[PDB]
Each structure stands twice: as C-alpha cells, then as structure tokens.
Design a protein around this ligand. Structure first.
Ligand SMILES: CCCCC/C=C\C\C=C/C=C/C=C/[C@@H](SC[C@H](NC(=O)CC[C@H](N)C(=O)O)C(=O)NCC(=O)O)[C@@H](O)CCCC(=O)O
Ligand SMILES: CC(C)CCC[C@@H](C)[C@H]1CC[C@H]2[C@@H]3CC=C4C[C@@H](O)CC[C@]4(C)[C@H]3CC[C@]12C
Ligand SMILES: CC(C)CCC[C@@H](C)[C@H]1CC[C@H]2[C@@H]3CC=C4C[C@@H](O)CC[C@]4(C)[C@H]3CC[C@]12C
Ligand SMILES: CC(C)CCC[C@@H](C)[C@H]1CC[C@H]2[C@@H]3CC=C4C[C@@H](O)CC[C@]4(C)[C@H]3CC[C@]12C
Ligand SMILES: CC(C)CCC[C@@H](C)[C@H]1CC[C@H]2[C@@H]3CC=C4C[C@@H](O)CC[C@]4(C)[C@H]3CC[C@]12C
Ligand SMILES: CC(C)CCC[C@@H](C)[C@H]1CC[C@H]2[C@@H]3CC=C4C[C@@H](O)CC[C@]4(C)[C@H]3CC[C@]12C
Length: 1398
C-alpha cells in the first residue's frame, strides 16, 4: 500500500548494498514520523488526566515558559505554511501523493497538543518531566535520517523540493532549541531540597547536587548545609506504614502458632515485603534493562573486528558501529545509576523502620522478657542486626541477576566456540562451592573473635578508671601483661581471617585467566578443523570479563543470606515478646485516698513465692509516711510493686494522680547538670535556684570545673555517689507531682547534709509540705518527725502507728530502737609500621603481574594472526602445540605473582596492627596524672576501641584494592598507545577531566563520611541510656518525649547517609562518561586508519578498552575511602607521642631495706598542680620522728591533699626537696619509691577477676600469707563461705560485694604489704560505724611499728596523735602535741572550739 500513499518505493534492500547508502524517502516520511507521534498520542490522555486529578494551584509565569511556548508556536505556523504550499501549488492539475497532505495535517494536530500539555504543566512541582523530554529526543533521533537525506539530495544539485527542505531544516533546528530550554530547573525557589523541582535531564545526570560539590570544595561543611530528607522517608512516615503490616502478620503468625501444638516466627520478611513491594518492581525493571544492554557491546565489537579483517566492506558500516557503541553504553549508564539510587535508598528505609520499631518496643516490653538480655546485648540488636538487614537489602537483586548474566554468557560463548565451552563450565561449577565454604569459614572466625575484643575493652575501661590506684601500688606491669595476652589470641584469629580473605580475592581475580586458558586449549586440540581467529578470541575474552562479577558475587550473597537468617530470628524473638501487664494497678482519680492496697500480693518470678504477700494499707493526701524493717523483708519491692514493675499474684492497688520516684540506684543522663534537673520541663529561675539550695547542691556547683553547665554523664565529668544522689532528689523535687516515692535516698550521704536535706526538702517544714511522701529507710534518725510508720516482716505488714504510739504499745520496735545508742607524614608513619622492606617486594609482585598480563594479550594477538597464513589442512602441529604451550605458561606466571603479592601482604598488615597497639598501650600507662585529669575517659577508650579496629580491619583491604585498580588502568593505557600512538593526544584532555572530577568528589565525600560517623553513635548511647532508665521514665509518664527524641536522632543521621549515597551516584555519571569516551575515540581512530591495521590489533585494543570503565570509577571510590580511614592512624599517633613521667627505675638505686626508720624530711617545699597555676603549697619545712604518729589539719582549702600526692611523686617538685632515711625521694627511680610506701585510698575500688589477683596481681605472696591477711582484716569467716576460696570471682567494679566488705578488703590489701611508712587520708562520706570501728582498731593494732601520717576533716579522728601539723596559706603555721596545742589558745584551739571538740 505505502507505494501509492507516496507514489515511490517503500523498501528495497539494494539501497543499502552500496558505498553511498540512504533510506527511501517513503520509509522516512512514514515509519520514522509514526514512531515519535505514536509515543505522544497513546500516552498524552493519561498524562493530562493525571494532572487534572492532582492539581492544586498555578505557578507564576516565567521567561522559560514564554520561550518554550513561542517556539512551539513557530512549529505550528511552519506546519500551516507547509500545508498551504501543497494545497495551492497542486491547482487540481495532477494526482499529488497522499503523504504530501496527511503529514502536515498530523503535525498541526500534534503542535496544538504540545501547546496544551505544556500549558497543563504549570500546575506541577516538576515542570520539565520525562514525558515531553523523551518526545523531543525521539523526534530529533528519528528526524536525523531525513535531515541527511534531504541535505545530501540538495547538495547533489537537485532543487525540486528546495522550499520543503527549508521548512524541514528550520523545524529540526527549533526542536533542538526547545530541548535545550527544556533542560533547566525553572524553580519554585523552594529552599527545602533541589531534587523535588529538578528537570528530567538534571535528575538522570544528578546535576542538581553540584551546588553541594561547589560548597564543600571552598570551605568545610556542616549539618546546616546538608538538605533535610524527603517527607516519604521521615521516621514517623516509615514507622506508621511498617507498623500496619507488622501487626497484621504478627497476629496471623500468633494464630498459626496457637492452631499448632493442639514464640511465633517467619513473619518479619512478609511485613517488610508488603511494606516496600512497589520499590522492588521499579528496581527489577531497571536492572533487567541493564542486563540486556550489557550483552550489546560484545556483538558490536565482533562487527568492528570483521570491518578491519577485510578492506572492501563499506566505510559507513565502521562509523555506524562506533556511534552505536557510545549510545548503548550511555543508555546503560543512566539505567544502572538509577537502579542503585533505588536500592541504596531502600536499604536506609529498612534500617530506619527496624531501629525505630525496636526502640518503641523497649518502652513497653514485659519484665520477664526483658531480664533475658543484658543492656549491651539489647543495644547490639539495634547496632548489629538492623545493620545486617540493611547490608543484605542493598544487593538482593543479584540472586536472580547473577544467574541471568551467567546463562546469557554461556549462550553467547557456545555461539563462538561450540561444545568446547563445557570445559569452561567445568571450572565455573568448581569455584562457586569453594568460595561459599571459604566465605562461611571466614565469617565464622570473625564472629568467634568478637568475644576477645569485648574482654579487652572491658579490662581497659577498669584500667583507665582505676589508674590512680595502679600508680600508687606500682601495678602497671601486671595490667600491661594482662591486656597483651588477650591481644595475642585476637591477632592469631586476625591472621587466619586475613589469610582466608586473601585466597578468596585471589580466586575472584584469576578465574577469567584460568577459564580462557582451559577453553582455548580444548577448542584448538579437540579437532583440526578448529582454528582460532580475532572474531572468536577477542569476543570470547569480552564474555570472560563479563562473567567475573556474577561468578564472585553469587557465593557472597549465599553466605550473607545465611547470616541475615540469624539476625531475623533475633529481631522476631524481641519484637514478638509480651507487652507489660498494667491490669493490677488502677488510676481511678478522685479516690479520696492517694494510695490503697486491697489484700494484694506480688512477685519478681511467676514460678516462685510472693515477695510482697497479702498487704492491706491505705494513706490520705498530704501525709508523710515511713516504711521500715529488717534487711530483705520487702522494702524496695513495695515501691516496685506500686509502680507495676512486678508480677501480680492476688488483689489490686489503687493510686490517685501523678507520681515522682527516686530509686536506690541512681540514673543520670548525658548532658549538663541543669538539663538533668529540668528533665524536659521549662526553666523558672526562682524555683530552680530554690531547689539547688534546698538539695544542698550549691557547695558542689561551686567546685565543679564547668559550674552549673558541667558536662555530666558517662562521656563527661565523673561525679561521686553522694553527688549523683543529691542530683537525683533535685530532679524529682523540681517536677512538682502529687505523690513522692523515696527508695532510701539519704543512704548515700552524711548525717549533717542528711539533716539539712530532711529539714529543707521533704520534712514537715520543707518544700514538699503539700505532697504525700512514702519514705523507705534503713536508718531510724528521722522517725519522730513522720506522721505514720509501718514495719514489714517476711513480705507482710506487722504493726502500724505514730512514733510515740509504737513505744507506748511496747512492740518489737521498742527493743529494736536500742540500736540508736591528612598530612603526608601520616601515610609514611603507616608504611614504616608495615616496614619498607615488605612494601618493595609486594609492589614488585603487583608490577610483575601487570607485565605478564600485557604479555599474554600480545601473545594471543600473535596467535590469532596465524589464521591468515595457514588453513584447516596446512597448519603445522608443532606450531599449534607451541602456540598453546606458552599461552598456558603466561597464564600460570600471573597466577604465581598475584598469589605472592596477596599472601605476603597479610603478614605485613597484621605486623602493623600489632606494633601500633603495643606502642599506644606502653605510652598511655606512662602518662603523667595531668593527662588523665584533663582528658575525659571515653575519649581515650575510643582510640583503643574504634581506631585499633579501623586500622586492623577495613584499612588493609582499601590499600590492596587501590594498587590493584591503579595498575589495571596503567596496563590498559599502555596497550592502547602501543597499538595506535596517536591516541596519546586524546589521553591528555581526558586525564585533565578525570583528575578534576576526583578533586571535587574527594573534597566532599570525606566530609560527609566524617559527618555520618560523628552523628550515628548518639542513637546507640541514647538507646543504652533509656533501657537503663525504664522504671524512672515510666514513673514520670515521659514515654512520648523519649520517642520524639529518638526520631530526631535517627532523622539527623539519615540525611548524612542519603546525601553521601547521592554523592557517589553523581561521581559515577562523570567517570562512566569519561570511560565511554575512551572506547568511542579509540574505535574512531581504528576506522580512520583501516589501511594500516588488522582485525587482531582492533580486537586487542577494544577488548580491554571495554573493561576499563568500572575500574576508572573504583580507583576514585578507594581514594576517598583511604583519605577517610587514615585519620585513625593520626589519632593513635597523637597519643603514642604524648608526654611521660620520670623513669620507673633509675641507676641510683636505694639501699637494701631502705625505709628502715621512716625519717621523713621536708625542706622549703613547693608544688603547683599544672605549669599554668600559682603554687598550691609553698615553703614547707619539717622533720618527722621514727615511728611517730601525725595528724595534718587546716581550714578547708588549706591544700592538705597535696601532701599525699607529692610524697608518692604524683606531682613533681616546683622547689625545695623531700628526704626519707637520708635518701632524697627525687633522685630514686619512680617504682623504687612507690613500691615501698603504703597507702589506704579514700574510696574503695576493685578489678573484675579473682579475690587472689585483687590482693596480689603479681602472684608473689603465699596462700597462708593471704589467709592471715584476711584473718587480721576480719574477712576469713566470709571468704571461707564461698565455694571457691581465693579463686572466687568479683564482677565489674566488685559490684557483687556490698560496701562494708569492699572497704574492709581494701584495708586487707594493705595488711599484706606491711611496710614501715603508712599514709591515711580519711574520707568525708557515710560509713557503717561497726566497719569504721573494726577498721580503726585494726589500724592501731597492726601498724603500731610504722611511721603514720593521717589526714582528716574532723578533729575527733586526730586528737590522740604524737603531733598535729596546721597549715593554711600553703605554709606551716603551728605544730605540737594535741593537748599542748589546746593548752594555749591559738589557731587549732579556735577550730576545736568551732567543732565543739574542746
Ligand atoms: C582492576 C580491577 C578492578 C577491581 C574492582 C572493581 C569494582 C569492584 C566492586 S563492583 C562495582 C559496582 N559498580 C558497577 O557499576 C557494577 C556493574 C556490574 N556490571 C553489575 O552488574 O553490578 C558496585 O558495586 N557499585 C555500587 C556502589 O557504587 O557502591 C566491588 O567491590 C563490589 C562488591 C560488592 C559486594 O560484594 O558487596
Ligand atoms: C544492527 C544494525 C543497526 C547495525 C549493524 C550493521 C547493519 C546495518 C549491516 C550489517 C550487515 C549488513 C548486510 C550485509 C549484506 C547484505 C546483503 C545485500 O544483498 C543487501 C544488504 C545486506 C542485507 C546488508 C544490510 C545492512 C547490514 C545488516
Ligand atoms: C547529530 C546531528 C545533530 C547532525 C548530524 C548530521 C550528519 C548526518 C550530516 C552533517 C554533515 C553531513 C555531510 C556533509 C557533506 C557530505 C559530503 C557529500 O559528498 C556526501 C554526504 C556528506 C558526507 C554529508 C553526510 C551527512 C552529514 C554527516
Ligand atoms: C543513528 C544516528 C545516531 C546517527 C546516524 C549517522 C549516519 C546518518 C551517518 C553515519 C556514517 C555516515 C556515512 C559515512 C561515510 C559515507 C561515505 C561517503 O562517501 C558518503 C556518505 C557516507 C555513506 C555517510 C552517510 C551518513 C552516515 C551513514
Ligand atoms: C553524525 C553524528 C551522529 C556523529 C558524527 C559522525 C562523524 C564522526 C562522521 C559522520 C560522517 C563522516 C564522514 C562521511 C564521509 C567521509 C568521506 C570519506 O572519504 C572520508 C571520511 C568522511 C569525511 C567521514 C568522516 C567521519 C564523519 C564526519
Ligand atoms: C599493599 C600496600 C602495602 C602497598 C602500598 C601502596 C601505597 C604506595 C599507596 C596506597 C594508598 C596510596 C595513597 C592513597 C591516597 C592518596 C591521596 C592523594 O591525594 C595523594 C596520593 C595518596 C597519598 C596515595 C599515595 C600512595 C599510597 C600510599
């Protein structure tokens, strides 16, 4: 038919079989018009209805809107002129062809539709969308054929359609110009994020990010510069979608588990899939288009090898293949980078949905379920298992895609080499099992090794917390050796893991070499009719390069799916657990009684006895009541049951209004002290200042170094147990609730501040007078002031009444009350730690691999050329066997050098990991005490934890990957320039683009990786903090505040990760385009020089210029990764080079048994705590008698504490000297001093481990010497009770031992040492007077033969010494015997008068 639509031939293949080919005009004017117009009309009705059903308001008019609309107006006018010239010129005189009329008539209809859809677009947020952008591209790429046909016909000299040709040329020019205007963003000027307003072309090329790239280059960037994340991706948006499917599938699985057997599992993957399925479909279609286009380039490669293998194939075929190579690679790059945007965004959305669901569950999980986990083990559920589901979600499409790429590669190989490909398949089926075994083994070693790290870190945290005691006792060598041993076993595992990883990477790298050496050898040896040529060889090498990624990726997805299955069981177990039962505690307000117990019973364990048995009491408003009894009788369980933190056995409790709670064990948040007091409430100056005074807190705030704004918390300044207790009561009293529950808060503070706090805060004269207050006490001191008292016996109420009524009744209380009687030198530091001798041979082995690789490609280029000299009958068998032999030899040679390079490097990186730790630890233990006072302990721990882990884990594999990519690029550029040296002129321009794109990327990505790394840890420390605080958070009803604070943290991290993900999608567009241009210009050189080239050279060049493109990208990715991770070596190096104390042992040795008398002597002494300060102590001058007993005293701030520090040389002397037994303590080695003096520390600390190593970590004393030390300490009767005697184990900080035996055990340690000189610095805190008395008599009984110096804050502790020493302005004022010092009125007498002592 079309022959009489156009009066000319529609198709004739004899137009293409010539040097000057063109298409028939009938084909151009029909099919190449109907393609772009058919795309427009089939979809425009839907695109119009989509806007009509989603419009809100019009945008402003713009210059670009005018400019687009007027040029489509010219397209409409030209279509009218074109129809007018056909309709007037025909004059009815001849039968003009139909096409001459239909085509203009179609264009008139289309330009009216284009004006209409452009007008409709002014309601949308994104103006220039995909729909019109692909119409202009399709129109311009179809019109290009007719453009060259018309201009070539006109240039040949025919003018028969000149006017029509001009109307076409103008219409083609204006479409290119409309496409250029259609590229710009045409902003709404919304400051939120450019990605919502960006055009289709800017979106696919990520050209809306250049605004951050140009910002992060010229100056540092910060969290205010990073765009806020999209509303579809906010934590509230994701959790409210996910929870809808979670509840549905969890309830279904619960019902299925209840239908069986007559916890639920296999529901979390169903809930995730149903939440996100639409993102999976969009990702699948993009990946499938890439997996089609990846097999186009090998077919276009074969055509170019054929075009070089004869010289009468038409010249236009060569240029057309070069254009199609560039075009196919460009379309593939845009699809691939979109697929990655969707996949890496989905992995972040899955993490966010799990982390926020785990957090919200923790606030409501039952007590029986919660006891099954440690705090660190619940934090690992958010830190490890949520991250494992992200790491799998990023790559899961590789499970189907890798199989498809393998099957298509085997098909396109059978087409080139027939049945011989089965010899290559025999290699591919052997390597996949081996990689899955080595990958699951190395993952198993990595998980087992994780336990050793935790043990080392826990010991370190106790070493750095106890460092003052390690210095006093000279114990640093014992704790140094203890850490080193655990490191050795950790390094042994690290070497085995590193060796398994190096053989896995070797097999991934060599498999294309092995499979090609096997396949070409079998093909040539099996049948003498088989002869190898450039088309078969260099095409097959391209398919062997396509196979490398899917063959290595499949084993790693299999071993990762086996890991994520364990993480899924842990998440399903936790999220499926029972919610807390509220039904036994009732909040009926207006109950005319604040609290009411109805025969109730409760327990800590539903299998066990009731801990608070039948109890029946009730209490009215504004009533202060006290709870008392013997130890373990039930006291703190009564408050815990009232809060609902226990299992009900019987009855119920009723409560009226709001509650405040103070626990026996204090909970404190990271923040300022002011933030902990205000606890999310608004500030109000008068009330705030009144609370700080009432809680006796101002005397602490006067001496904390930050004042009221001091950084308290685990990552901040440390506070005493009495300070943490005051702060806890100060928080509770600021909130102003109805009911106060107190779990014996006075138990951690002295009786004088206790009396002050009782009168100010909670007594019938204090702040809380209008509030009902239930007070647990172990002390009797305040009972006379209470409204009503109850005694508990064996979990139930025994007696009740006022204080006087209990004594008048003569109950058991009346007898019991008788108890009241980037710089380059950092890279060089790391290379010297590996050692420069190994760097040389590792680099030499990597270079020899590159030379053997080049040699094997040159040999194959020679081998295929034999096919033009010989034939299937005449090829010599000696030459066949010689060609096969040395190709196998060059295949083996590069296998040997790659194995030597990888396997040697594993010993090099493990050697550096050892040296850096060994030098850090040895410096830190020698640091002076100023370092530990000025530096917060969490900072030092991070260097020993995260940094050491960075240096020994990721760092090594980044350096290996970089040198592998670098030599791959250099090897490839050498082979191209060796084949056609004119290409060296094209290398300079592309090299200037490449180094510029690297410079702009690496300046930004390094900052986003830092900004991610600093903002992630606050999520896990806040989760650890809230899980530790649950009964406090519930008692105040604060759950909604805490949920919002978690959402703010997660959203703040989420934007740093997503903008870093975007930053590497931008990079890839530029570097894949630079890569694509190397193959396009390389292909063109070999078309223009076809007279002096062969199919062998063209195959040799294009084959490895096709694999360059992903290597060009990965070299820049690794450069950013190394520049990020190398900072770990800087931080370690910083502390490795901080200052040290005086030598522990000097040649000047003290004589044998040196402290023989104890003649301590001071001359004009002077000290300051830091070079920045004036002197704390000045001009001290004294002589101390052999075995003399001394007290030191002075007005608070006298500086007394300087003596105990400087006598051990913790502080170095500013002037004067000190002597002991004729030796000056400044000349002797620092351990030879410390080890001879004996000190009892002010505050007891124990190290987690045996009773044996807590008394003697050097294992130097004998078993009976320790038993008599516990006898003299009076602990024998306790230690003999434990199943293990001296081998029994203490937990963290000794927490399984109560405070009485802790203080006593620290006295027992000193008894074993038993030296001639003893220091005592009495503490100013609460103590059990029985333990105080038995310690004080033991001091007088057992150290009778020692010289003794005592420091105390009360004169009744001093008053029986041989001498008293009084100083105030850091200078001596008086000294004498303690009666004579009172006998004449003077400094000490006035004090003793103020103390009531004299
Ligand atoms: C010299 C020889 C060069 C050596 C290495 C080049 C590239 C290596 C990348 S593999 C690099 C890959 N980029 C691609 O474009 C892969 C294209 C491939 N055809 C595919 O289908 O995936 C990629 O992983 N991109 C994701 C990203 O941007 O993070 C691997 O490290 C990815 C490992 C993925 C994994 O197992 O988790
Ligand atoms: C796949 C396309 C887009 C690019 C590859 C080049 C194409 C256009 C080339 C490669 C081989 C060519 C064919 C080779 C031989 C003949 C036989 C002759 O009697 C008619 C032309 C015909 C049938 C050619 C048509 C054009 C052709 C198919
Ligand atoms: C890519 C778009 C924008 C433009 C493409 C235009 C192409 C197809 C045009 C531009 C210049 C044209 C060439 C100009 C001159 C000659 C010389 C003549 O003896 C044969 C045709 C030939 C060789 C033309 C072939 C077609 C041609 C290459
Ligand atoms: C497909 C799109 C993207 C590009 C199309 C390019 C076409 C129009 C180009 C590419 C190669 C060109 C040919 C290259 C060489 C010759 C030989 C010369 O003696 C006459 C022109 C002729 C035959 C050209 C005609 C136009 C041509 C076929
Ligand atoms: C047209 C767009 C899409 C791509 C650009 C292709 C370029 C590189 C192609 C298209 C047309 C080609 C020309 C067409 C015709 C001839 C005449 C011939 O005796 C020498 C080569 C020469 C001079 C070609 C050189 C390369 C050329 C200019
Ligand atoms: C396998 C190992 C032991 C071999 C050692 C490789 C050495 C020579 C390589 C590995 C990583 C490299 C560094 C990686 C990144 C940068 C930042 C860039 O702006 C300048 C070059 C510089 C500083 C490189 C210098 C050379 C380097 C240190």
């Amino acid at each position: 038919m079309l022959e009489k639509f156009c009066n000319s031939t529609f198709w004739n293949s004899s137009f293409l079989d010539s040097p000057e080919a063109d298409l028939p005009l009938c084909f151009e004017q029909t099919v190449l018009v109907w393609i772009p117009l058919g795309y427009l009309w089939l979809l425009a009705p839907w695109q119009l209805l989509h806007v009509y059903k989603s419009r809100t308001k019009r945008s402003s008019t713009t210059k670009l809107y005018l400019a687009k609309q007027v040029f489509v107006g010219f397209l409409l006018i030209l279509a009218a002129i074109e129809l007018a010239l056909v309709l007037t010129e025909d004059s009815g005189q001849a039968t003009v062809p139909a096409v001459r009329y239909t085509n203009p008539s179609l264009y008139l209809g289309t330009w009216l539709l284009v004006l209409l859809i452009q007008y409709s677009r002014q309601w949308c947020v994104q103006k220039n969308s995909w729909f019109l952008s692909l119409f202009w591209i399709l129109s311009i790429l179809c019109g290009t054929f007719q453009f060259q046909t018309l201009i070539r016909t006109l240039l040949q000299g025919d003018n028969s359609n000149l006017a029509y040709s001009c109307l076409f040329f103008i219409s083609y020019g204006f479409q290119i110009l409309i496409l250029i205007f259609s590229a710009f963003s045409e902003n709404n000027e919304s400051s939120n994020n450019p990605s919502s307003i960006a055009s289709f072309l800017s979106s696919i090329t990520y050209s809306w990010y250049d605004s951050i790239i140009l910002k992060g280059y010229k100056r540092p960037l910060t969290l205010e510069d990073v765009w806020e994340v999209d509303e579809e991706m906010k934590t509230k948006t994701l959790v409210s979608k996910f929870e809808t499917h979670m509840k549905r599938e969890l309830q279904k699985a619960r019902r299925a588990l209840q239908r069986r057997q007559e916890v639920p599992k296999s529901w979390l993957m169903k809930a995730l899939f149903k939440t996100f399925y639409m993102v999976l479909l969009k990702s699948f279609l993009l990946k499938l288009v890439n997996d089609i286009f990846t097999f186009v380039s090998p077919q276009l490669l074969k055509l170019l090898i054929s075009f070089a293998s004869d010289r009468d194939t038409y010249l236009w075929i060569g240029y057309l293949c070069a254009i199609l190579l560039f075009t196919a690679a460009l379309i593939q790059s845009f699809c691939l980078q979109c697929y990655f945007q969707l996949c890496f965004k989905l992995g972040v959305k899955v993490r966010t949905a799990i982390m926020a669901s785990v957090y919200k569950k923790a606030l409501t999980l039952s007590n029986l379920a919660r006891k099954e986990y440690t705090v660190g083990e619940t934090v690992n559920l958010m830190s490890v298992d949520a991250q494992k589901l992200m790491d799998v979600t990023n790559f899961m499409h590789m499970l189907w895609s890798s199989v498809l790429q393998i099957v298509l590669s085997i098909f396109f190989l059978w087409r080139e080499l027939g049945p011989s490909v089965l010899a290559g398949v025999g290699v591919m089926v052997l390597v996949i099992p081996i990689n899955a075994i080595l990958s699951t083994k190395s993952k198993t070693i990595q998980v087992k090794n994780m336990k050793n790290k935790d043990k080392r870190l826990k010991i370190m945290n106790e070493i750095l917390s106890g460092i003052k005691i390690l210095k006093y006792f000279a114990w640093e060598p014992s704790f140094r050796d203890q850490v080193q041993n655990l490191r050795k076993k950790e390094l042994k595992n690290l070497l085995a893991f590193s060796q398994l990883q190096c053989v896995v990477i070797f097999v991934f790298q060599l498999t294309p070499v092995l499979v090609s050496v096997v396949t070409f050898s079998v093909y040539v040896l099996v049948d003498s009719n088989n002869i190898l040529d450039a088309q078969k060889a260099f095409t097959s090498i391209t398919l062997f390069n396509i196979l490398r990624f899917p063959l290595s990726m499949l084993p790693m997805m299999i071993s990762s799916m086996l890991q994520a299955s364990v993480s899924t069981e842990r998440l399903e177990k936790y999220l499926g657990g029972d919610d807390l039962d509220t039904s036994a505690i009732r909040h009926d307000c207006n109950f005319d009684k604040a609290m009411q117990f109805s025969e109730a019973s409760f327990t800590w364990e539903h299998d066990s006895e009731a801990t608070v048995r039948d109890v029946n009491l009730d209490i009215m408003a504004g009533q202060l009541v006290a709870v008392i009894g013997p130890v373990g009788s039930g006291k703190s369980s009564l408050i815990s049951a009232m809060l609902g933190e226990m299992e009900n056995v019987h009855g119920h409790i009723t409560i009226k209004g709001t509650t405040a709670y103070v626990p026996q064990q204090s909970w404190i948040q990271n923040g300022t002290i002011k933030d902990n007091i205000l606890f999310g409430t608004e500030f109000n100056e008068k009330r705030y200042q009144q609370v700080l005074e009432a809680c006796a807190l101002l005397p602490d705030l006067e001496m904390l170094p930050g004042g009221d704004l001091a950084e308290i918390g685990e990552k901040g300044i440390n506070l005493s147990g009495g300070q943490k207790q005051r702060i806890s009561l100060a928080r509770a009293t600021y909130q102003n609730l109805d009911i106060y529950l107190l779990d014996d808060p006075l138990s951690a503070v002295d009786a004088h501040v206790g009396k002050h706090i009782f009168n100010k805060v909670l007594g019938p004269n204090g702040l809380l007078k209008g509030k009902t207050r239930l007070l647990v006490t172990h002390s009797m001191h305040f009972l006379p002031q209470v409204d009503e008292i109850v005694v508990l016996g064996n979990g139930t109420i025994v007696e009740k009444g006022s204080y006087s009524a209990l004594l008048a009744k003569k109950g058991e209380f009346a007898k019991n009350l008788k108890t009241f009687l980037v710089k380059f030198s950092i890279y060089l530091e790391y290379l010297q730690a590996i050692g420069l001798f190994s760097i040389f041979f590792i680099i030499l082995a990597f270079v020899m691999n590159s030379v053997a690789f080049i040699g094997s490609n040159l040999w194959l280029s020679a081998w295929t050329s034999d096919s033009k000299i010989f034939n299937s009958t005449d090829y010599p068998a000696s030459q066949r066997d010689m060609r096969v032999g040395v190709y196998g030899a060059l295949g083996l040679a590069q296998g040997i050098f790659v194995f030597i390079a990888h396997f040697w490097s594993a010993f090099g990186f493990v050697h550096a990991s050892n040296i850096l730790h060994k030098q850090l630890l040895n410096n830190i233990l020698r640091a002076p005490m100023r370092f530990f006072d000025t530096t917060p302990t969490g900072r030092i721990v991070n260097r020993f934890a995260g940094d050491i882990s960075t240096v020994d884990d990721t760092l090594p594999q980044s350096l290996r990957s970089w040198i592998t990519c670098f030599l791959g690029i250099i090897s490839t550029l050498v082979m191209i320039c060796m084949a056609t040296p004119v290409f060296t002129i094209i290398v300079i321009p592309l090299g200037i683009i490449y180094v510029s794109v690297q410079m702009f990327y690496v300046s930004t990505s390094r900052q986003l990786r830092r900004l991610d790394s600093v903002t992630r840890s606050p999520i896990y420390s806040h989760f650890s903090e809230t899980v530790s605080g649950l009964p406090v958070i519930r008692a105040f009803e604060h759950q909604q505040r805490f949920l919002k604070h978690n959402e703010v943290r997660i959203d703040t991290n989420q934007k740093c990760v997503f903008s870093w993900i975007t930053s590497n999608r931008w990079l890839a567009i530029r570097l894949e385009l630079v890569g694509n241009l190397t193959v396009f210009f390389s292909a063109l050189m070999m078309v223009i020089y076809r007279d002096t080239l062969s199919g062998d050279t063209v195959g040799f060049v294009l084959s490895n210029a096709l694999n360059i493109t992903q290597t060009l990208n990965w070299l820049v990715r690794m450069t950013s990764e190394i520049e990020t991770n190398i900072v770990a070596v800087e931080r370690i190096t910083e502390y490795t080079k901080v200052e040290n104390e005086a030598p522990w042992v000097t040649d000047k040795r003290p004589p044998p048994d040196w402290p023989s008398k104890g003649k301590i002597q001071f001359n004009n002494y002077q000290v300051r705590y830091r070079p920045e300060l004036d002197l704390v102590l000045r001009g001290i001058t004294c002589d101390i008698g052999s075995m003399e007993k001394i007290g030191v005293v002075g007005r608070t701030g006298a500086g007394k504490s300087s003596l105990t520090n400087c006598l051990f040389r913790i502080l170095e002397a500013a002037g004067g000297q000190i002597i002991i037994d004729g030796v000056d303590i400044a000349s002797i080695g620092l351990h030879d001093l410390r080890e001879k003096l004996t000190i009892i520390p002010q505050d007891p600390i124990l190290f987690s481990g045996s009773l044996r190593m807590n008394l003697d970590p050097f294992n130097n004393y004998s078993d009976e010497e320790i038993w008599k030390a516990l006898e003299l300490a009076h602990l024998k009767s306790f230690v003999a009770s434990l199943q293990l005697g001296l081998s029994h184990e203490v937990t963290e900080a000794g927490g399984n031992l109560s405070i009485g035996q802790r203080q006593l055990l620290c006295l027992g340690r000193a008894l074993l040492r038993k030296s001639k000189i003893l220091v005592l610095d009495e503490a100013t805190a609460a103590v059990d007077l029985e333990t105080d008395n038995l310690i004080q008599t033991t001091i007088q009984n057992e150290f009778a033969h020692c010289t003794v110096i005592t420091i105390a804050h009360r004169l009744h502790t001093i008053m029986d010494s041989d001498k008293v020493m009084v100083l105030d302005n850091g200078k001596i004022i008086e000294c004498g015997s303690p009666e004579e010092l009172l006998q004449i009125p003077g400094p000490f007498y006035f004090m003793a008068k103020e103390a009531g002592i004299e």
